[PDB]
Design a protein around this ligand. Structure first.
Ligand SMILES: COCCOCCOCCOCCOCCOCCOCCOCCOCCOCCOCCOC
Lengths: 30, 29, 29, 30, 30, 30
């Protein structure tokens, strides 16, 4: 169903934001 | 530091998005 | 209800984004 | 500067999310 | 670099948000 | 409809995220 499809896409965005946060922590530890 | 604080805020946003996904599956069921 | 919970989570996300913006200005200034 | 421009764009995204929340509350009310 | 990597992930987030937007439009189509 | 408005707001957020991605590339350049 399409709501389950959107839910999976949000789960994918959440994973990408976590990846950005990890990168910023590296910029700060710069 | 300020950049580390921003990163922690992004992690909080991700947790909120996962909660939205859980709610959407409940709506569908 | 489930949709209202989703809206509340979006409002929380917006507050977190405003905090990130303030921190960016402190980095700049 | 450019960081201040990004800050402004994040403030705009926050405003737009707040609008989506407003709209979802309206769907739920019906 | 790390900023360019963040930029790429932000672009992917934007693409997924557009897919969500399209699925929302399809939900409106039944 | 309201879902369609939400979809368009998500598209606008996606555009702002793309602009942030551009500015981050410019900061890196720079
Ligand atoms: C039937 O009923 C259906 C209802 O269906 C409802 C569906 O509702 C769906 C809602 O979906 C909502 C989705 O929201 C996504 C929100 O994404 C936010 C993304 O934020 C990114 C923020 O990124 C910030 C990056 O900042 C970098 C700073 O870098 C600084 C470097 O400085 C270096 C200078 O030198 C030190």
């Amino acid at each position: 169903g399409l709501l389950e499809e959107i839910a999976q896409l949000l789960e994918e965005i959440a994973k990408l934001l976590k990846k950005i946060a990890w990168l910023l922590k590296k910029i700060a530890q710069g």
